[PDB]
Every structure is written in structure tokens, then in C-alpha cells.
A paper describes a structure:
In order to investigate the function of the NTD of CSFV NS5B, we first made an NS5B construct comprising residues 1–694 with only the C-terminal hydrophobic region removed. For description purpose, we herein named this construct as the wild-type (WT). This construct was soluble and capable in GG dinucleotide driven RNA synthesis using a template RNA sequence derived from the RdRP assays established in the HCV NS5B and the JEV NS5 (53,58). The structure of the WT was solved at 2.5 Å resolution in space group P43212 by molecular replacement using a BVDV NS5B structure comprising residues 91–672 as the search model. The structures of the C-682 and C-672 were solved at 2.1 and 2.3 Å resolution, respectively, in the same crystal form by molecular replacement using the structure of the WT as the search model. These three structures, each containing one NS5B molecule in the crystallographic asymmetric unit, are highly similar with root mean square deviation (RMSD) values of 0.4–0.6 Å between the WT and two C-terminal truncation mutants for all superimposable α-carbon atoms with 99% coverage of the resolved residues in the structure of the WT. In the structures of the WT and C-682, residues beyond 672 are disordered. Although this conformation is likely not compatible with de novo initiation, normal activity of the WT and C-682 observed in the polymerase assays suggests that the canonical conformation also exist in solution and may be in equilibrium with the observed bent conformation observed in the crystal structures. In a time course reaction, WT NS5B exhibited low level of misincorporation with the mismatch fraction gradually increasing over time and reached about 0.25 at the 180-min time point. Lying in the heart of this NTD–RdRP interface, are two adjacent RdRP residues Y471 and E472.
Residue numbers in the entry: 13 to 88, 90 to 126, 131 to 272, 278 to 532, 538 to 576, 579 to 670
The structure:
């Protein structure tokens, strides 16, 4: 009766270990009365209790008393580490972050250095069909300095999560169930050439740097090699991260979902990022993949077909979603230490002192904000570290297998026999049989809280379950089935039409070639969406002399290029799933972004252009060509990046 009240309190208790000595009672037994909490330390949703016949509300006031007693004797003195001392010398002005859990030593001197504009061609195409641009959500919000420091105080300014005693030994036992011993002690640094192939030269400079990635490559390689040398020998470097709001000028990726970035971007200097990537390439880029389920290298237009083939081998498949609240701030020092031990498993012994020193620097990180304010972060992850994707994915896989096995009784070495997991940093889900998944979905919240990865406050304290394939959510997307004219069916990455329109029509800048790279990219993703697909085809049909400039672009003909990645011709897309299309279209009607005329004014504009003589891309749309009589004859075309 009082059970859900206790379930909520137990997610405020400090995690503890087993007891045996004392009777260990759950939130159920507590609300049944006649149990008195001896301690507030929780182990698997149990607490210790003396059978002294209490009132259920006396028990609750007791446990709550024990917890608040604990919380005030625990919020207490962070001595700065010698290797971070150098940042104090650069301090010039008093701090004003008002942080309650990490040092704010002050503010350094300001240093010597983008708004949301429309893509005019793409935007005018939408305006031309009655899509009302003013009703579309804002998709690239820039935070001002005051809400930025608020985001720091709100999300970063925290003490490290308590975790179950012995957790990381258990996680290490999960790792040993899925290591790849044929790769142990084999990873070595890579050559400049391999590094330079896969690296964005626009990659951002840190607070004290001036040159970006490409400029350091061109003229300051010796500075990167010196950092490698220091770390390799175990000497300290002047390691620091810079903090910027999401969608700031320096918010640039070194390598369609961009919602997978936190509000505060924290990133090491470009010299330092190159140093880490040169040595740890094979691990941070996952070449080869050793993280089970890792999908960070699978294209979004492929991922759901791959998952479908696994869903299809279960009697009663369900998927349980991982939804950790602000994952990067929940990463603890013991978590980083676990990743370090795993890296050292795969790396040759000559890089172990490198790995150790890097990790030490990452456990207490000086962070400089854009405005110069300094804070000292304990643990956590900066979203811009080269290890973010690989470290987070591995950490997520271990913690989720741990939680599932503790929850269901399945032993770690038996996970691969009853469940399939997929991860992209903190994002992911596992597929398994309905009984197993429902048992994991109810208990996972409390176990994952005690493992130091609290889940987003869900409905009834259960994790989200998908009972049908296309209710799965992953990388901001969800499966939508399409029908091909060869009588096959496949799945594409679905997402709300309102969100696709806003992403397509807007840009941060400080050219039609870029708009056609966007249109081709969105065509690769969203050709299941008749409205997106037709706008793409029109924009691509604009100024055909101009080559395209941006996750993907096409050499030669975009329609051929499409046929290469997707494996069908655009013209063979017969049908999109009726129900899932209606779901993904609802916010068009809720926001008033379209009207009853919009779908036909768009089709008409395509027919109007496609009946004309020539070779028109719009005629690659099955239904447009149906009404023009003309077809599109492709040239020779290839997808690149």
C-alpha cells in the first residue's frame, strides 16, 4: 500500500553491500509493517531491518531520517592535485560560478576570439508548398552565458555517485566474459597517415590554443609527439578541457543524431586530442570492434535492418531501453579506472604508462569555460574526449549486462545466450524474451541507481519496454517499414517530420553546393517520408551545374549514389508503413506546420517540373513519375563522406 513511497526513498539511499548478518527487507516487506530499518545502505533494493513490529509510517520516517542523517555527513575538502597546480598561475579574477561541489578557483584572462540562419533554397522550397517555417521547432538553440553557468551548476556541479561496493570487480567479471583474448596486448599507435585520413581539420582549438586540428597537423606535429612522449614516460602534461555550450562556434566533431551531445561540451585541446587519438586509435575508433553491440560505426540507414534480423529469432521478443539521466556526469573515477584496465588489456605493455597517466589526468580535470571561469571537475566525462564513444559504450554494455543478470538471475557468461544488446555511447537497448525483459525492466531502475547510473524518472519506476519492433528508439530514431516494388520489405530510420524539416531548413553560420549535400544526406535517411523525399528531389533538381559540397555527398548522380547505399532504386519505394507514418506526422498537425494543401502542392510542383522534357530527378519518385509519364535515367553515381 505504501510500497511506491518506499521505492522512491530507496533510490535516495547510499548503495551498500550484502549483509547476511541482518534480515534484508525490500520496499514491499517494509510497507507491510512490522520491520524497522537498521541502516539506510541499500543492496538490490533491500535494507537491513530488525523485526520489532513497527508501524509502516514509523518505518518510513525512520529510513528517511537515516538517509538525511547520512546525506549531511556525506556532502562534506577537495585538495588540488599537483599536476593541476599550473592552472592556478593563470588565474586573474575571482570566480563567480557559485559551485557547491567543485573548486571554482577563479577566472583566467579572456582570450583573443555563429547564429541560426535559414538554408534559403531548402527553406524556400518548403515555403513554396505551404509548409509554415515559423511553426517548426527550434533545433539548434544556443545557450547564453547565464543559462550556461546554470547548466554547469545544475548538471556538472556534483559529487561522484556512490556505487555498490565491489561493483567494478563484478563489471570486470562481465568484461572477462566478453573479452577477445586473440587481441590482448596487441594494440599499438598508428601512423600520421592513418590518423590524418579520419580526422576533421576544422576540429576545435582549446581555450589557450589558436590553431585547429588541421593547422596543428600542418605545422606543429612536434608538439603532439612531445605530449605523447611525456605521457608515455608517465610525466604529467598540462591537461585541461574547455567548456562551451552546445551549438557554439567551437562545437565541432572530430569524426544525423546530434541530440546525443550534452548541454555542456567539454573537450581537451586539439594538440592533446591528436596525441590521444594517435596512440589509442584502435580503441577510440573501434578498429576492430571489441565492444559487443557497438553501433557507433553503423550508418543510420543500416542499423534497423541489422537489429530486425536479431528481433526475428525470439519467440516473444521485447526490447528494453537504456535511458540514463545525463550519462557523462554519472561516470565515476572507479568507472574511468575500469576502462583504463580494459584499454591496458588490449594495448601493448609499452603504452600502459601512457594509459595510466592519461586516466590520472581525467579523474580531476581543470575545465575552462568560454568566458574564462575555471572549475575542477572530479571524474565524469567531457563529451569531447576521444574516448567518449568507446569508453561510454563499453561502460554502458558492462553496466547493463551486470544490471540485467543481477535482475534476472542469468549468469554473466550466459547473457549472449538470452539477450542481444546494442549501444551507441550511453544510448542503447537490449532485446530478449518478454519474461526476461519485463523482469529486467522493473528491477533495473533500482539496480542501475546503485550502480551509479540513475535512469530517467519513468512511469511507475519501470524502464521503457518495446513490445513491437518499431517502438524501439535508438540514436534519436525509430524503425519505419517500407515496401519495395520487388516485393521485399525493409526498415529505415524514422523520426518526426517536424524535426526533419527544422534540421533541413536551418543552419549555424558565421551556398547551394551545401544545400544539395544536405538534401542528398536527408534523402539517404528519410526517403520513406514522401514530404521530405520530394523536397529533397526538388532541391537536388536546382542549378545542376553545381557540384555538392555534409555527413554524406554524391559523386556524379545522386539517384545512382542512393542505389549504392540503400540497395534499391529510389523509384522502387512503393509504400511507407501506414501507421508509423501517421505517428511520425502527428506533430505536423499539432504544431500547424502544414495544411490540407501541403502534400498536394508539393506533389503538383514535382509533376509540373517532371512532365517537362528532359531528365528530371523528381521522376525518380514513383508516384510523381506515375503522373508525368517521364522517368529519370541515372548516370554513374557513388556515395562518399
Amino acid at each position: 500500500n505504501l510500497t511506491p513511497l518506499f521505492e522512491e526513498l530507496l533510490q535516495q539511499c547510499p548503495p551498500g553491500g550484502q549483509n547476511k548478518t541482518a534480515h534484508m527487507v525490500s520496499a514491499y516487506q517494509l510497507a507491510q509493517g512490522n520491520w524497522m530499518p537498521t541502516s539506510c545502505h541499500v543492496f538490490m533494493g533491500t535494507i537491513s531491518a530488525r523485526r520489532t513490529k513497527t508501524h509502516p509510517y514509523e518505518a518510513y520516517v525512520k529510513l528517511r531520517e537515516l538517509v538525511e542523517e547520512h546525506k549531511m555527513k556525506t556532502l562534506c575538502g577537495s585538495s588540488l592535485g599537483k599536476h593541476n597546480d599550473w592552472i592556478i598561475g593563470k588565474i586573474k579574477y575571482q570566480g563567480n560560478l557559485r559551485t557547491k561541489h567543485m573548486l571554482n578557483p577563479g577566472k583566467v584572462a579572456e582570450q583573443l576570439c555563429r547564429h541560426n540562419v535559414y538554408n534559403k533554397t531548402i527553406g524556400s522550397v518548403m515555403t513554396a508548398t505551404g509548409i509554415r517555417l515559423e511553426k517548426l521547432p527550434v533545433v539548434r538553440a544556443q545557450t547564453d552565458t547565464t543559462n550556461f553557468h546554470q547548466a554547469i551548476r545544475d548538471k556538472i556541479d556534483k559529487e561522484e555517485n556512490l556505487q555498490t561496493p565491489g561493483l567494478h570487480k563484478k563489471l570486470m567479471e562481465v568484461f572477462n566474459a566478453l573479452k577477445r583474448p586473440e587481441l590482448e596486448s596487441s594494440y599499438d599507435a598508428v601512423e600520421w597517415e592513418e590518423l590524418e585520413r579520419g580526422i576533421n581539420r576544422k576540429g576545435a582549438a582549446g581555450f589557450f590554443e589558436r590553431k585547429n586540428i588541421g593547422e596543428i597537423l600542418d605545422s606543429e606535429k612536434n608538439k603532439v609527439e612531445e605530449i605523447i612522449d611525456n605521457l608515455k614516460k608517465g610525466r604529467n602534461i598540462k591537461y585541461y578541457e574547455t567548456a562551451i555550450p552546445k551549438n557554439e562556434k567551437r562545437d565541432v566533431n572530430d569524426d544525423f543524431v546530434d541530440e546525443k551531445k550534452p548541454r555542456v561540451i567539454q573537450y581537451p585541446e586539439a594538440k592533446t586530442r591528436l596525441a590521444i587519438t594517435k596512440v589509442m586509435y584502435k580503441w577510440v575508433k573501434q578498429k576492430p570492434v571489441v565492444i559487443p553491440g557497438y553501433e557507433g560505426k553503423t550508418p543510420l540507414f543500416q542499423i534497423f535492418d541489422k537489429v530486425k534480423k536479431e528481433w526475428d529469432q525470439f519467440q516473444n521478443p521485447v526490447a528494453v531501453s537504456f535511458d540514463t539521466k545525463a550519462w557523462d556526469t554519472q561516470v565515476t573515477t572507479k568507472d574511468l579506472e575500469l576502462i583504463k584496465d580494459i584499454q591496458k588489456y588490449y594495448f601493448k605493455k609499452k603504452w600502459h604508462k601512457f594509459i595510466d597517466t592519461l586516466t590520472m589526468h581525467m579523474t580531476e580535470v581543470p575545465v575552462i569555460c568560454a568566458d574564462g571561469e575555471v572549475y575542477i571537475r572530479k571524474g565524469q566525462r567531457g563529451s569531447g574526449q576521444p574516448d567518449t564513444s568507446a569508453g561510454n559504450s563499453m561502460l554502458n554494455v558492462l553496466t547493463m549486462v551486470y544490471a540485467f543478470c543481477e535482475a534476472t538471475g542469468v549468469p554473466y557468461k550466459s547473457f549472449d545466450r538470452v539477450a542481444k544488446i546494442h549501444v551507441c555511447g550511453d544510448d542503447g537497448f537490449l532485446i530478449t524474451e518478454r519474461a526476461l525483459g519485463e523482469k529486467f525492466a522493473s528491477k533495473g531502475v533500482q539496480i542501475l541507481y546503485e550502480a551509479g547510473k540513475p535512469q530517467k524518472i519513468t512511469e511507475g519506476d519501470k524502464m521503457k519496454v518495446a513490445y513491437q519492433f518499431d517502438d524501439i528508439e535508438f540514436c534519436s530514431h525509430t524503425p519505419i517499414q517500407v515496401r519495395w516494388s520487388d516485393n521485399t520489405s525493409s526498415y529505415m530510420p524514422g523520426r518526426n517530420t517536424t524535426t526533419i524539416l527544422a534540421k533541413m531548413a536551418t543552419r549555424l553560420d558565421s551556398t547551394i553546393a551545401y544545400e544539395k549535400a544536405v538534401a542528398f544526406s536527408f534523402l539517404l535517411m528519410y526517403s520513406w517520408n514522401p514530404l521530405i523525399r520530394r523536397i529533397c528531389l526538388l532541391v537536388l533538381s536546382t542549378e545542376l551545374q553545381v557540384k555538392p559540397g555534409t555527413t554524406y555527398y554524391y559523386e556524379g548522380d545522386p539517384i545512382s549514389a542512393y542505389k549504392e547505399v540503400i540497395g534499391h532504386n529510389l523509384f522502387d519505394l512503393k509504400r511507407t508503413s501506414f501507421e508509423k507514418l501517421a505517428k511520425l506526422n502527428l506533430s505536423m498537425s499539432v504544431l500547424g506546420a502544414w495544411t490540407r494543401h501541403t502534400s498536394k502542392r508539393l506533389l503538383q510542383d514535382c509533376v509540373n517540373m517532371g512532365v517537362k522534357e528532359g531528365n528530371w530527378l523528381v521522376n525518380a519518385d514513383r508516384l510523381v513519375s506515375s503522373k508525368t509519364g517521364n522517368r529519370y535515367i541515372p548516370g554513374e553515381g557513388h556515395t562518399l563522406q
